[PDB]
C-alpha cells in the first residue's frame, strides 16, 4: 500500500524476542565453576527458525542486550562481563583462565544497577551471505573419513560465541538469573525457498521422523461445507 | 557432432520459456547430452537427480567433466515426454537450487552417524522418492511452484525447456566441491490408460552446457 | 553538564525503537556486497506467485496424501454438484493454509484487496463436456442448484480452451463461498479412460496487502 | 584492501587490555599503610611488549581507567583517588603525606558508585619519540662509576607514575580490589626492527639465558611431508 | 536539563569505542614533531619485504641451527627428489612461521591474495646442471615423479641464470604443496667442491592482505 513501511522485509524481521536463557545460581550443579557460555543458535527456536528457510541466501546483522535479576527480581550491587568470541579465538576454560585478560577479545565492564545496556556486532561471516544449508560436508578440511576437531564449528558458517563471568577475587554474594534478547537492523535476502512446514526432529539438522502428520485435516469431504 | 552413427530424430517445435527474462553471463559447446530413457508407470511416484556429480558420466564432455573443476556455461535443459494422442497423465518439472537431500533416520533410536555412502551414491540412473509428498526431505510438495518450473500436460504439450544461470554460495565457486542444484520430476495426477494399450511412457531429458575448466594446484 | 533535563522515561526499553548502537568491532571492514540473481523486496511480490490449491481431504494415510490435493471427476455424476470449495478466508484453516498465500498472511492480522484464481483441466485430447464455476457473494444463502448460482457472477467452462478459464473476486474482507456444479453430463469417446482428475491454481492480485503483524506460531 | 581501516597501524594497536593489577585489602601485609603505587611497565607483559620492538622509534599516547570492586563484586559507598606523578614531582611516602594536597600534581575526586571514569595523558616524553633501547648508559649523569640515585628512573625514558589513596580521616570500612586498563589513540612509528622471538629472561632487560630453544621444530625432515 | 532521554545502555564500556577524553594536563604543549627518514604506513608494505625461508629441520643442537635454514645438495642423488617444502599455509606452523610474513599474519585470522617466491643458487662458477621446481594445486593427489609434476604449473631451473628463477602462486586461500625434484644428475668439474648448499627467499605480493585480528600469543 501507500504506507508499506510496516509490510517490508525489515518490518517482517523487526522484532526483539527471546534468543538465549542462561542461569547462574549461587550454588548448584548446572555451573559449579561460576561461569557459563552460550552459542548463537537461531535455529534452536522453531519460531524464529521457520522464518529464515523462506529464503536460501540471506544477510543480517544483530544487536544484543543483557538483563541481570534475582529470582524475586531484586537489584544487587555487582558487575557481570560479556565478550564476543571470534571463531579463531579460544573459548575460556576456567574461571581463572588467561582468556579473560586477552586484549584482542573485545569486552566491556558493566554495572547491572545501570538499566540494561545493549551492544551490536556487524557482519562477521567471511562469505558474502549466510547459508543455512551447506549441500556438502560439514567440515571444510581435506579429510572426509575421520572425526576432525573442526567438525560442528566450521569457519564458513559459525558467527561467534559469548561467555559470561563475574570478575573479582572476592566471592560473589548473590544469585544471578540472566536473560538475552536480540534484534536485527539490516536484513536482505536473495532467493526464496519453499517453506518448511512439517514437524522437526533435530535441533539444527533438517532430518525428520517416519510418523507422518498433515498440516491440516479440518475439512472432512469436498461435498461437506 | 555424431559419434559414428548417432543422428537422432529431434523436435523442432520446442516451447521457448525464459528464466526471469535473463540470459546467462560470461566468465564470473554444441554437444547435446543424452540420458537413458525413463519408464513412467501407474504406481510410480517420481524421481530426482543431482548435478553436477551424477552428470559427469552420461555426457560426452560430461565424462571429461569429471576431471574439470570450474564451470562457465549457460544451461538449456530440454525435457521430452512422447506419448500417444489417447493417453492420460500429468508431469511436473522444476529446479530446486541448493537442494539438500534429506536423509531418513528411522528405527527405535532417532540418531544416526555420518551419512552412509550407499545413500550418497544412488548411481547414474537415479533414485525413487520414499515419500514424495515431502520430497524425502520434510519439504512440502505443494510449494515447488515458487521456484522456476513448467507444466507438462499430455493433452497440451509433449516437451518443455528450462534455462538457468549459475547461482552459487560464493562469488568464487567450485563445481566439484559444492553441489549446485538438482531436477525434480513428480506426477500430480496418476496416469490412466485403456486395457491392452502401451503401459510404458518414455521420458528423456537433454541439456547442453558450454564448457568447464581444469584448474589444478601444486605444492 | 549543559543545562537541560530530559523528561521522565529516559531508560524505557521497547523493542520497536529505532536505536543505533556502537559496534563491538570499531575497526573491522565488512565483506564487499556482490550481485546475486535472486532478489527480494517485499511480501507483495511473493504473494504474486502462483501455487496449487487443495480440495479433497477424505483419506489420511501417509501413502495417500497425493489424492488430497486433487479431486476426481466421473461421467456417472451429472446435473449435480461435484466439489464445493470451502469458505473464502485465507487466514483461517480450510483450503488456503496449504498454499503460500495463506501461510504468509498467517503472520498478519487483517488484509484487504481482490483475489483471482485460475483452473487447469487434465482430460484426454478426445474428451469433451461442459462445466460450471459458481461464486456466491457473502451474506447470501447457500446455493441450491445450477440455476440459483447462475443468477450471480458465474464462470462457464469450455473445453475448446484448455486452461483459459479463470475467476476474479472483486473484493474480499462472513465469508464467501465458491462451488463447482455439473452443467451437463460428461461424455467420453470409446477407447478412452472413463475418468480424470482435476487440479487448480491460485495467486494474489496487485491490490492485495496486509496491515498489521501477528505473533502466530504452531509447530514446534 | 579497499576497506583497509581495520588493517592500519592504529587498528593494529587499537585494543584496550590488561595493563595493571593492584590490590588494596582491608587488612594484610601487601599494603599495611592503606595505599599503593604503580609504575607504567608496558614491557612487563610479553603480549603487549613483543609488539613494540617490531619498530625502534615510535610515538604513542594513552588513556587510563579505574575499576573498584569487592572480591564478590559488590559496590560500596566510598571514594578513591588517582593522580599522575611527573618525573620531577616526588612520590608519596606516607598515607598522611604532604604530597596529596600538592596543587601542581593533577588529581581528581571520583565516586566509584558512578560507572568507571577514564582519563588520558598526552605526550610527556621530553624527546621527540620514545626509544625502547638506549644504546649507552642507563643514567644521563656525568658519573659512570657509582650507583647514582637517578639510576632506573632517567628523565629521557620514564613516562610518569600513578598513586592510589582513599582520602578521609575516618577509617575505611570495605576491602578494595582495583583493575587497570589502557589504550592508545595516536600511534606512529618510523623504522622497523627485527622481531624479538626467543624466550625472555628479565622483565625489562633484553638479556637472555643459555638454554637454547627454537621457535619451531614440528617438521621432522625435508623428505617428510 | 534540556528535554531528552537517552536510550538505555548509556554507560556501556567497550574497548572498540571511538571516545575522546579530557587531557589530564590541559595546559601542556607537546614537543614539536620532527622528520625521520624511517616511516611506517601499514602492514601491507612490511609484508612486501623479502626474508629468508627454511626447509631442513633434522638437527636440534644449539650449535647446529644454521644448517636448518639451508638444505644440502649432492651429485650422488639424481633423477629423484631432493627436498619437499611443507604445505602452503603461512598462518599455521611449518615453513612460514620463521619468516616475517607468517608471524605478522599470526596476529590475524584469515587472508587472501597471491604469493610469490624467488630462489638463489650458491654453486661454483664452473658448475652446471638442471633443476626442477614443482607446484601442485590443492586437492590433487601427491606427486609421484618429475613427469607427474610436469603436467601442472612447474618452473625449470637454468644455471645460465644465477637467481632469475622465481615462482608466483596465482591464488591461495586444504593446503597446496610444492616440492623440488632432480630433472638431471648433478655434474661437477674436477678440482671443484663436490657439494653445495641451497638457500631461498620469499615475500608477499601486492594483493595480499589480512581481514580480521586475532588474539594470539605464545611466549611468554
- Nearest by Cα to B102 from B150, B140, B147: B140
Q: In this structure, how many other beta carbons lie within 10 angstroms of the beta carbon of residue B11?
A: 11
Give the CB-side neighbour count of residue E121, counting CA atoms within 13 A.
21
**Inter-residue contact E13 to E165 (CB < 8 Å):** no
Grid coordinates of D149: 640515585
- How many Å apart are CA A185 and CA A118, to the nearest integer? 13
Interchain proximity E40–D55, CB inside 8 Å: yes
Interchain proximity D23–A169, CB inside 8 Å: yes
- How many Å apart are CA B145 and CA B150, to the nearest integer? 8
The answer to whether the Cα torsion of B183, B184, B185, B188 is positive or negative is negative
CB neighbour class for C43 (10 Å; exposed up to 12, middle 13-18, buried from 19): buried
Spell out the SS3 assignment of C106-157: CCECCEEEEEEEEEEECCCCCCECEEEEEEECCCCCCCCCHHHHHHCCEEEE
Q: Chains meeting E at 3+ CB pairs closer than 8 A?
A: A, B, C, D
**Inter-residue contact D140 to D126 (CB < 8 Å):** no
- How many Å apart are CA D61 and CA D149, to the nearest integer? 28
- How many Å apart are CA B120 and CA B218, to the nearest integer? 29
Q: Which residues contact B219 (CB under 8 A, 6 or more apart)?
A: E84, E85, E87, E88, E134, E135, E136, E143, E175, E176, E177, E178, E179
Calculate how close chain D gets to E70, using CA atoms only, in Å.
11
DSSP string, B140-176: -GGGGGGSSEEEEETTT-SEEEEEE----SSSS--TT
- Nearest by Cα to A195 from C59, C210, C36, C105: C105
- How many Å apart are CA E29 and CA D41, to the nearest integer? 25
- Nearest by Cα to E133 from E113, E158, E99: E158
Interchain proximity E85–B216, CB inside 8 Å: no
CA distances from D27 to D5, D75, D143 (A): 49, 19, 44
Say which residue the cell 599470526 belongs to: E106
- How many Å apart are CA A3 and CA C136, to the nearest integer? 32
- How many Å apart are CA A56 and CA D89, to the nearest integer? 66
Longest dimension (CA), chain D: 76
Calculate how close chain B gets to A170, using CA atoms only, in Å.
45
Grid coordinates of B93: 518439472
Q: In whole angstroms, how large is the CA radius of gyration of chain C?
A: 25
Task: Give first-to-last CA distance, chain C, whole Å.
Answer: 52
How many distinct helices (H) and strands (E) make up chain D?
2, 11
Calculate how close chain C gets to E1, using CA atoms only, in Å.
2
Q: Chains meeting D at 3+ CB pairs closer than 8 A?
A: A, C, E
Strands, sheet with E130-136, edge to edge from the N-terminal-most edge strand:
E81-83, E177-181, E130-136, E154-158
Interchain proximity C122–B171, CB inside 8 Å: no
Strands, sheet with D161-165, edge to edge from the N-terminal-most edge strand:
D35-39, D161-165, D79-85, D107-111
Using a CB-CB cut-off of 8 Å, the residues of chain A touching B102 are 206-208
Q: In this structure, how many other beta carbons lie within 10 angstroms of the beta carbon of residue D99?
A: 16
B64-100: burial string, b at 16+ Cβ within 10 Å, e else:
ebeebbbbbebbbbbbbbebeebbbbbbbbbbbbbbb
Q: Chains meeting C at 3+ CB pairs closer than 8 A?
A: A, B, D, E
A contact test, residue of E5, E7, E10, E12 with most A CBs within 10 A: E12
Using a CB-CB cut-off of 8 Å, the residues of chain D touching C33 are none
CA distances from A140 to A12, A134, B67, B118 (A): 33, 11, 21, 22
Restricting to C residues 144-173, those with a Cβ less than 8 Å away from any Cβ of A are none
Calculate how close chain D gets to E184, using CA atoms only, in Å.
19
Grid coordinates of D148: 647514582
Q: In whole angstroms, how large is the CA radius of gyration of chain E?
A: 25
**Inter-residue contact C57 to C98 (CB < 8 Å):** no
Using a CB-CB cut-off of 8 Å, the residues of chain C touching A219 are 57, 86, 94-95
Residue B190, chain C, CB below 8 Å: the answer is: yes
Longest dimension (CA), chain B: 67
Using a CB-CB cut-off of 8 Å, the residues of chain B touching C66 are 132-133, 188, 190
**Inter-residue contact E32 to D59 (CB < 8 Å):** no
**Inter-residue contact D105 to D83 (CB < 8 Å):** yes
**Inter-residue contact E210 to D190 (CB < 8 Å):** no
Interchain proximity B137–A206, CB inside 8 Å: yes
Tell me how far the alpha carbon of residue C198 is from its chain's centroid. Answer: 17
Phi, psi of D101 (to 5 degrees): -90, 5
**Inter-residue contact E213 to E109 (CB < 8 Å):** yes
Residue B153, chain C, CB below 8 Å: the answer is: yes
- Nearest by Cα to E38 from D189, D203, A133: D189
- How many Å apart are CA D187 and CA E43, to the nearest integer? 14
Q: Which residues contact A191 (CB under 8 A, 6 or more apart)?
A: A55, A56, A57, B97, B167, C36, C37, C38, C40
Task: Give first-to-last CA distance, chain A, whole Å.
Answer: 34
**Method for structure elucidation:** cryo-EM
Parallel, antiparallel or unpaired: strands D187-189 and D57-60: antiparallel
CB neighbour class for B207 (10 Å; exposed up to 12, middle 13-18, buried from 19): buried
Q: Which residues contact A35 (CB under 8 A, 6 or more apart)?
A: A24, A92, A95, A163, A164, A165, A166
- How many Å apart are CA B178 and CA B168, to the nearest integer? 8
Interchain proximity B219–E139, CB inside 8 Å: no
DSSP letter at B115 equals P
Grid coordinates of C54: 487443495
Chain B residue with CA closest to E135: the answer is B218
**Inter-residue contact E58 to D221 (CB < 8 Å):** yes
**Inter-residue contact C159 to C123 (CB < 8 Å):** yes
Amino acid at each position: 500500500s501507500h504506507s508499506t513501511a510496516e509490510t517490508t522485509l525489515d518490518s517482517f524481521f523487526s522484532r526483539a524476542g527471546l534468543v538465549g536463557e542462561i542461569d547462574l545460581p549461587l550454588e548448584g550443579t548446572t555451573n559449579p565453576n561460576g561461569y557459563a557460555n552460550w552459542d548463537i543458535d537461531i535455529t534452536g527456536y522453531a519460531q524464529m527458525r521457520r522464518k529464515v528457510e523462506l529464503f536460501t541466501y540471506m544477510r543480517f546483522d544483530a544487536e544484543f542486550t543483557f538483563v541481570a535479576c534475582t529470582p524475586t527480581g531484586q537489584v544487587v550491587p555487582q558487575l557481570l562481563q560479556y565478550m564476543f568470541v571470534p571463531p579463531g579465538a579460544p573459548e575460556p576454560d576456567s574461571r581463572e583462565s588467561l582468556a579473560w585478560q586477552t586484549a584482542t577479545n573485545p569486552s566491556v565492564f558493566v554495572k547491572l544497577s545501570d538499566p540494561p545496556a545493549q551492544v551490536s556486532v556487524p557482519f562477521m561471516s567471511p562469505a558474502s551471505a549466510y547459508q543455512w544449508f551447506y549441500d556438502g560436508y560439514p567440515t571444510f578440511g581435506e579429510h572426509k573419513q575421520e572425526k576432525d576437531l573442526e567438525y560442528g564449528a566450521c569457519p564458513n558458517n559459525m558467527m561467534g560465541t559469548f561467555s559470561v563471568r563475574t570478575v573479582g577475587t572476592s566471592k560473589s554474594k548473590y544469585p544471578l538469573v540472566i536473560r538475552i534478547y536480540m534484534r536485527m537492523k539490516h536484513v536482505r535476502a536473495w532467493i526464496p525457498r519453499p517453506m518448511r512446514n512439517q514437524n522437526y526432529l533435530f535441533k539444527a539438522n533438517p532430518n525428520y521422523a517416519g510418523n507422518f502428520i498433515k498440516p491440516t485435516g479440518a475439512s472432512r469431504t469436498a461435498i461437506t461445507t | 557432432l555424431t559419434i559414428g552413427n548417432s543422428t537422432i530424430t529431434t523436435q523442432e517445435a520446442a516451447n521457448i520459456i525464459v528464466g526471469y527474462g535473463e540470459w546467462p553471463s560470461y566468465c564470473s559447446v554444441n554437444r547435446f547430452y543424452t540420458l537413458d530413457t525413463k519408464l513412467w508407470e501407474k504406481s510410480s511416484k517420481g524421481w530426482y537427480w543431482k548435478f553436477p556429480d551424477v552428470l559427469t558420466e552420461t555426457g560426452v564432455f560430461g565424462q571429461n567433466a569429471q576431471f574439470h573443476y570450474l564451470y562457465r556455461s549457460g544451461f538449456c535443459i530440454h525435457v521430452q515426454c512422447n506419448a500417444s494422442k489417447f493417453h492420460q497423465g500429468a508431469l511436473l518439472v522444476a529446479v530446486l537450487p541448493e537442494y539438500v537431500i534429506g536423509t531418513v533416520a528411522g528405527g527405535t533410536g532417532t540418531e544416526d552417524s555420518h551419512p552412509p555412502y550407499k545413500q550418497t551414491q544412488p548411481g547414474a540412473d537415479g533414485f525413487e522418492l520414499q515419500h514424495p509428498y515431502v520430497l524425502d526431505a520434510g519439504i512440502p510438495i505443494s510449494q515447488l511452484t515458487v521456484c522456476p518450473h513448467q507444466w507438462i500436460n499430455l493433452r497440451t504439450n509433449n516437451c518443455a525447456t528450462i534455462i538457468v544461470p549459475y547461482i552459487n554460495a560464493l562469488p568464487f565457486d567450485s563445481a566439484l566441491n559444492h553441489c549446485n542444484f538438482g531436477l525434480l520430476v513428480v506426477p500430480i495426477s496418476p496416469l490412466d490408460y485403456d486395457q491392452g494399450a502401451t503401459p510404458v511412457i518414455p521420458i528423456t531429458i537433454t541439456l547442453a552446457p558450454m564448457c568447464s575448466e581444469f584448474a589444478g594446484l601444486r605444492q | 553538564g549543559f543545562p537541560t533535563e530530559l523528561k521522565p522515561g529516559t531508560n524505557q526499553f521497547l523493542t520497536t525503537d529505532d536505536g543505533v548502537s556502537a559496534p563491538i568491532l570499531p575497526n573491522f571492514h565488512p565483506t564487499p556486497c556482490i550481485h546475486i540473481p535472486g532478489e527480494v523486496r517485499n511480501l507483495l511480490e511473493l504473494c504474486q506467485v502462483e501455487t496449487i490449491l487443495e480440495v479433497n481431504n477424505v483419506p489420511t494415510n501417509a501413502t495417500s496424501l497425493m489424492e488430497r490435493l486433487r479431486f476426481p471427476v466421473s461421467a456417472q455424476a451429472g446435473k449435480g454438484e461435484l466439489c464445493a470449495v470451502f469458505r473464502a478466508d485465507p487466514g483461517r484453516s480450510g483450503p488456503w493454509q496449504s498454499t503460500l498465500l495463506g501461510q504468509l498472511c498467517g503472520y498478519y492480522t487483517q488484509w484487504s484487496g481482490s483475489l483471482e484464481v485460475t483452473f487447469m483441466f487434465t482430460g484426454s485430447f478426445m474428451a469433451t463436456g461442459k462445466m460450471l464455476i459458481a461464486y456466491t457473494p457473502p451474506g447470501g444463502p447457500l446455493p441450491k442448484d445450477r440455476a440459483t448460482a447462475m443468477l450471480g457472477t458465474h464462470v462457464i467452462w469450455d473445453f475448446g480452451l484448455q486452461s483459459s478459464v479463470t475467476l476474479v473476486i472483486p473484493w474480499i474482507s462472513t465469508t464467501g463461498l465458491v462451488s463447482i456444479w455439473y452443467q451437463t453430463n460428461y461424455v467420453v469417446p470409446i477407447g478412452a479412460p472413463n475418468t480424470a482428475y482435476i487440479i487448480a491454481l491460485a495467486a494474489a492480485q496487485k491490490n492485495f496487502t496486509m496491515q498489521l503483524c501477528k505473533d502466530a506460531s504452531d509447530i514446534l
